[PDB]
Amino acid sequence: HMNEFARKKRALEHSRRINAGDLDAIIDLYAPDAVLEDPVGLPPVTGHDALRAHYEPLLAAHLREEAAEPVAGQDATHALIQISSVMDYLPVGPLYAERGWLKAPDAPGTARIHRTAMLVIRMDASGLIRHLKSYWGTSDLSGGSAPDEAARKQMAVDYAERINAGDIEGVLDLFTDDIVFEDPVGRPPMVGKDDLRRHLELAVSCGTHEVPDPPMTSMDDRFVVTPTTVTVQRPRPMTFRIVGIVELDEHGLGRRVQAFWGVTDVTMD
Amino acid sequence: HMNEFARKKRALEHSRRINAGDLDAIIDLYAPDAVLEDPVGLPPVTGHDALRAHYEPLLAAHLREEAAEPVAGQDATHALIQISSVMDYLPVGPLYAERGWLKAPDAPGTARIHRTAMLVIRMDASGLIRHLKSYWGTSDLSGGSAPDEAARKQMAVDYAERINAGDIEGVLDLFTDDIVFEDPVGRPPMVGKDDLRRHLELAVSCGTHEVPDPPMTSMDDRFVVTPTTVTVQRPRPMTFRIVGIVELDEHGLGRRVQAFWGVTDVTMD
Ligand SMILES: CCCCCC(=O)OC[C@H](C)[C@@H](O)[C@]1(C)CC[C@H]([C@]2(C)CCC(C)(C)O2)O1
Ligand code: NA
Ligand code: NA
C-alpha cells in the first residue's frame, strides 16, 4: 500500500525522531519484533525491549543526525538514507574504544564522535520498520582506528572509473563469475557475466557517467556501500540517485550487488 | 533549447493565417527569397511573386487547414506540423484532375477536396520561413487515384510492427547498407547497418513501442513521412512524438532517415 514517496518520507521521520530525544516515539516506528543491525557485521538487535537498550545511550550522548535526501527501492518495502552523525563521547564512546574502533581521547568529557552511515530500511505496508541495516565501519568513524579495507573501499570507486571510460571488461574483472546484479532492486536480477556484459554494453551505449559519494563498509568489510549519481545522455539527459551494496567474497571480488534506486529517483535535466 | 517553442508557435501561425485568408498576412511570414515545395516532388516556388500566385487560387477555393500539435527539430531551424485541409474543387481542382491526381467530379460546383500533408518548415534566426517543404501524394488526396505507393507507405508501418516485436534483423532489412539515420535531427547521424543495430538493440532493451499515424509520401514516391508516438518503459516511462522523413531508393529500400523530434517533444507519465 505504501509507495516510494511515503517510505522516503518515513525514513526522514526516523532521523527526525532520533534528533528530538523522545525515546518512545522512535520505538513506535519499529515493529514489535523488529531487527536492527547497528552496525552491520555485528549480531542484530531484536525487540522493542532491546531497542530501548540500543537507542537510550545514544540519546544521552545527544545524537544529532544530518540526513541525506533518501532514495527508495522498487520493492514496496525498502528506503535507504545516509546519516551523518555527531555525538558526545560519553557514554557510547568508551564502548567503541573497547571494541577497537576509537582511540580513547585525552578529554573524554569534551570529545565528539563523527560517523557516516548508510541505513537500509525495510518497512511493511503499514509504515512499521521490520528491519533496519545500518552500514558503517572504522573508516566511517572518528577516533583514529582504515586497515586496507580502503583497498576494498576503492573497489566501489574503481567501478565508476572503469565504466566512465568504457572499459567494460575491467568492470567485469571486479566481480565473481556467479555475479548476481540486482538493478534496480525489485526487478529480476542479472546472473552471470554474460547477463552483466549485456547490461554494461547498454550503459556505454546511452553514455552513462557515474560519480560516487565517499563509500562506506560494514564493520566486517563483507559489504561495500556506494552512493552514486549516474547521469545518462540518452534518451535525452537524465540523472539517477542510487545506493548500491556489494557483497565481497574471500578475496575481495564482487559476489552480489543490490542497486537501490526507485522511479522517483530519476530526473529530467 | 526552448526556441523550439517559438518555432512551433509560428508553424501554427502559418496554419492560422491560411485560415484567415489575407494573402499578404500569410506572405509576411516568408523571407524575401523563400522556397516552397508544395507538393514535394514538383518544381519549387521561389520569391513572393510565385508565393502570391501559389496561394491565390487556393485561398479562392476557401482553403481551411486543421493543424496538429507541431513537432520541432534539434537544429534551431526546423519545425514540422501535420496539416489536414479541405477546399472547393474549382478552381485548382481541374489542375489536379489534368495531372491525374483526381478524377473529375460529376458536380464540380459542390465538390470539395481533402488533403493530409506534412509541413517541414526551415526558418532563420528571425523566424521568417526560408524554405518550406510540404509532403503529400495522390493517396493523400481525394478524387480517386498506386499499388506501389501503398507498398511504400506500408514500410512506415512494417518498421513499427517489427520494432515492437523485437525483430531487429527484420528492421535492418528495410534499409540499404548506405543508411544514414539522423536520430535525432541535429545530433550526429548513425551511418551503416552496424551503427543502427546498436541503436536498435538499445531500443528493444529500453522497451520502445512505436505506433505511427497514417503516413504520407512525396508526389514522386521517394519520401515516406511517418508521424509516430514512441513510448519507452525503461529507465522510466516517457513518450516521444517524432515525425520521420525516409528517403527511398529505386528498389524501395530506405537510404536516408531524418527523425525530427525536439527536446520539447518528450513527456514523462
Ligand atoms: C558499487 C556497486 C554498485 C554499482 C553502481 C551502479 O549500479 O550504478 C549503475 C546504475 C544503477 C545503472 O544500472 C543505471 C542507472 C540503471 C539503468 C541504466 C541504464 C544503463 C540505462 C537504461 C538501461 C535500462 C539499459 O540501463 O543505468
Ligand atoms: Na577511525
Ligand atoms: Na487518392
Side-chain angles (χ1 to χ4, degrees), chain A, chain B residues 2-269:
Chain A
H1 293 82
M2 202 156 30
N3 71 321
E4 285 183 12
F5 275 138
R7 306 194 303 281
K8 276 224 216 156
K9 290 300 272 152
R10 187 53 99 79
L12 295 148
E13 173 71 7
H14 184 281
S15 159
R16 197 199 52 78
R17 292 198 182 166
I18 295 276
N19 288 318
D22 185 353
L23 171 46
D24 300 302
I26 308 167
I27 315 280
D28 180 35
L29 290 167
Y30 296 91
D33 70 340
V35 184
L36 164 61
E37 310 195 59
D38 183 15
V40 179
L42 275 204
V45 167
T46 306
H48 282 212
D49 281 7
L51 287 163
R52 283 197 162 70
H54 177 72
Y55 283 120
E56 192 281 316
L58 295 166
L59 301 175
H62 298 0
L63 187 57
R64 162 67 210 177
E65 291 189 346
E66 217 213 340
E69 207 257 300
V71 309
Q74 286 176 69
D75 57 17
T77 43
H78 271 110
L80 297 70
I81 188 163
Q82 207 201 243
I83 297 299
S84 295
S85 308
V86 74
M87 72 183 340
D88 302 318
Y89 187 69
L90 302 160
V92 199
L95 164 57
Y96 289 159
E98 276 155 41
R99 300 177 179 153
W101 305 349
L102 314 176
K103 293 185 101 189
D106 300 336
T110 66
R112 300 215 92 193
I113 300 180
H114 308 263
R115 187 225 299 182
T116 316
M118 165 68 47
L119 278 41
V120 181
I121 306 168
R122 175 146 47 86
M123 298 155 249
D124 60 20
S126 47
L128 286 188
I129 299 170
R130 297 275 161 194
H131 209 168
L132 195 155
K133 290 168 166 163
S134 156
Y135 296 75
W136 54 276
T138 71
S139 45
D140 316 279
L141 176 83
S142 316
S145 302
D148 310 46
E149 77 192 4
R152 313 170 81 80
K153 267 208 178 175
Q154 172 61 18
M155 165 266 145
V157 194
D158 260 297
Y159 177 103
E161 175 162 34
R162 293 151 210 235
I163 205 173
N164 285 320
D167 183 3
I168 309 192
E169 281 286 352
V171 170
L172 296 144
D173 289 335
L174 286 168
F175 311 91
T176 68
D177 305 338
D178 54 319
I179 174 56
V180 173
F181 209 119
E182 289 194 60
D183 159 41
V185 165
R187 295 236 315 163
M190 299 153 241
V191 188
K193 307 192 187 187
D194 278 289
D195 278 359
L196 187 50
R197 172 181 325 269
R198 255 185 298 284
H199 189 80
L200 299 158
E201 264 164 34
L202 293 171
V204 200
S205 210
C206 49
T208 87
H209 191 269
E210 291 194 23
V211 170
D213 302 320
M216 313 144 249
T217 52
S218 42
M219 254 316 307
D220 64 6
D221 300 326
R222 258 215 310 137
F223 304 107
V224 180
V225 182
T226 314
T228 47
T229 312
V230 179
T231 67
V232 311
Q233 298 292 59
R234 296 184 148 268
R236 204 193 120 177
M238 297 178 274
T239 314
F240 282 71
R241 276 187 75 259
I242 318 154
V243 158
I245 288 93
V246 175
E247 188 186 342
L248 298 186
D249 69 11
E250 174 180 15
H251 302 98
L253 274 169
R255 204 190 172 260
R256 313 260 177 268
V257 171
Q258 271 188 313
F260 281 95
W261 66 264
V263 182
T264 53
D265 289 304
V266 202
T267 312
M268 278 326 98
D269 42 325
Chain B
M2 187 143 140
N3 198 352
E4 290 178 10
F5 197 90
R7 293 198 288 288
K8 289 203 245 217
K9 298 290 244 173
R10 177 118 309 154
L12 302 135
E13 182 67 13
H14 171 291
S15 170
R16 192 223 61 95
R17 296 198 186 172
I18 301 274
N19 278 338
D22 189 23
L23 177 46
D24 296 336
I26 298 166
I27 277 154
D28 292 330
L29 296 171
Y30 297 60
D33 48 326
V35 187
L36 161 65
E37 298 186 48
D38 187 8
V40 164
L42 272 193
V45 164
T46 325
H48 298 205
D49 258 15
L51 289 181
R52 305 190 186 92
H54 193 71
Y55 290 111
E56 200 271 318
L58 304 162
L59 289 167
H62 306 106
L63 180 68
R64 94 171 301 271
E65 291 182 348
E66 216 80 63
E69 201 70 28
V71 153
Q74 290 164 62
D75 58 7
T77 73
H78 274 110
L80 281 70
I81 175 159
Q82 201 199 291
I83 294 296
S84 290
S85 40
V86 66
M87 81 184 339
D88 288 309
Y89 180 70
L90 265 44
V92 200
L95 169 58
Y96 306 157
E98 160 78 36
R99 289 176 160 147
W101 305 350
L102 302 181
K103 305 186 239 289
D106 289 6
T110 73
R112 307 207 75 195
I113 301 173
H114 313 267
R115 213 208 295 168
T116 319
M118 189 51 79
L119 299 197
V120 192
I121 314 169
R122 181 210 313 170
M123 282 140 294
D124 62 3
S126 149
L128 290 191
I129 304 159
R130 169 67 26 78
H131 195 336
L132 192 161
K133 282 172 158 75
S134 167
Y135 286 91
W136 60 278
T138 62
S139 46
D140 310 281
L141 199 68
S142 306
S145 46
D148 157 78
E149 182 169 45
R152 278 166 143 68
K153 266 198 180 186
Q154 175 55 20
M155 81 108 71
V157 195
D158 269 300
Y159 181 106
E161 173 166 50
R162 291 169 220 186
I163 206 179
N164 312 341
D167 179 6
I168 302 186
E169 294 299 326
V171 161
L172 289 167
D173 300 332
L174 299 155
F175 304 88
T176 63
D177 281 348
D178 315 328
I179 172 62
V180 189
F181 212 105
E182 289 202 43
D183 180 18
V185 161
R187 267 140 92 174
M190 299 164 299
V191 200
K193 274 205 200 177
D194 278 304
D195 279 28
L196 196 58
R197 169 179 286 95
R198 271 192 287 285
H199 182 72
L200 302 177
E201 281 168 341
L202 193 77
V204 198
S205 188
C206 279
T208 79
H209 182 80
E210 331 207 344
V211 55
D213 304 320
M216 309 128 266
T217 52
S218 46
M219 194 58 91
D220 51 21
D221 281 338
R222 250 212 311 141
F223 304 110
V224 174
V225 185
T226 313
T228 48
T229 307
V230 181
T231 69
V232 305
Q233 286 301 79
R234 292 185 265 295
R236 170 213 199 241
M238 50 192 56
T239 302
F240 297 65
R241 258 172 93 261
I242 315 167
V243 166
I245 318 293
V246 199
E247 197 166 332
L248 291 182
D249 66 14
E250 321 164 325
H251 311 93
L253 273 69
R255 53 183 329 267
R256 304 184 106 60
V257 168
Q258 278 192 296
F260 286 89
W261 63 271
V263 292
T264 47
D265 296 314
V266 197
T267 288
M268 295 55 55
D269 36 4

